[PDB]
């Protein structure tokens, strides 16, 4: 009991510190970034596999 | 009781004016808005703790 | 009496099972514990908010 | 300063609404409503802005 | 016997948040493994006196 | 209460501008910067535990 | 210095790029990955640092 209580409150912990970002407004920003980002590796492996 | 009131009473408006000739209007002017600014600095803690219970 | 011993044993395993699972969470959650205690340091890097008196 | 701020803020509605459009394009319904709900926010300020660096 | 409760139930939250704020999660993580590991050392021996007697 | 509150406004916008005279922005701007990395370096210890504890 | 700090991120994005051609011409699929995903950020770097040097 007395560890799965302190497991819960570090993960508390995070949240709230992770979340302290969301309140930012950074989410969206985020969310757009990685919808460009995301797939840039799988094209350029796809590219040059077909080079190679 | 009805003459010690007023003897606190002349004795409030003095110290009150004493004080209201100190303060000066620039240098209020900011430590108004950084009390503003400290107390939104807590109240973001709470909407903070809020979200994380949301998530 | 065979019989008896053999659940027991398997349920020793199952202790140790268990007790592996619980060691491994807590070094999982030491890091995690650590990486809190200054993540706040990259979130009072927006502009906004003034929780980080260094930024 | 006060026009400065202005702009800036003139500059961040229209952004948020060209990712509001890109959002269309490639993402979905909810992002596209995130998107415009910000930039309601930044308008409103935007306005509000002026407002006083008028006088 | 009904105010007696009551004030009981005060005084036990009034120390019970007096403790839950010495907890520190570093510390006790390692107490609680230390401990399971403390009673698996005991459920062993059972396990051998069990295994000696079919012996 | 009501007064010496306002007495204790007035000494701290006395000293919170006595202290802003001080401060020099070609040397803050730095020492920002300093603090900021020494935050950054105990954040990577942090996720050097991370990753040992993965490895 | 700013534009320098550009030129170095230019040039090893492409140094990354021509390690993952060799990764894939002699190594695996994983390696590839790898050596994109650093490409990723160091082009991400890069913009970002332009965006500013043009300012």
Aim: aromatic share 2%.
């Amino acid at each position: 009991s007395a560890f799965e209580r302190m497991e819960e409150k570090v993960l508390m912990q995070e949240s709230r510190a992770q979340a302290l970002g969301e309140l930012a407004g950074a989410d969206l920003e985020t969310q757009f970034a990685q919808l460009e980002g995301g797939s840039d590796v799988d094209d350029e492996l796809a590219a040059l596999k077909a080079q190679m | 009781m009805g003459l010690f009131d007023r003897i606190k009473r002349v004795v409030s408006s003095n110290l009150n004016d004493l004080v209201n000739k100190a303060e000066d209007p620039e240098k209020m002017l900011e430590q108004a808005i950084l009390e503003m600014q400290e107390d939104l600095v807590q109240l973001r803690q709470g909407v903070a703790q809020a979200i994380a219970a949301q998530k | 009496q065979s019989t008896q011993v053999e659940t027991l044993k398997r349920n020793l395993i199952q202790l140790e099972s268990k007790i592996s699972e619980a060691k491994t969470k807590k070094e999982m959650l030491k890091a995690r514990i650590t990486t809190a205690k200054a993540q706040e340091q990259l979130q009072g890097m927006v502009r906004g908010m003034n929780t980080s008196s260094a930024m | 300063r006060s026009e400065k701020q202005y702009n800036d803020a003139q500059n961040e509605i229209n952004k948020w609404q060209r990712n509001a459009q890109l959002a269309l394009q490639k993402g979905d319904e909810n992002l596209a409503r995130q998107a415009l709900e910000r930039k309601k926010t930044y308008t409103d300020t935007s306005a509000a802005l002026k407002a006083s660096l008028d006088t």
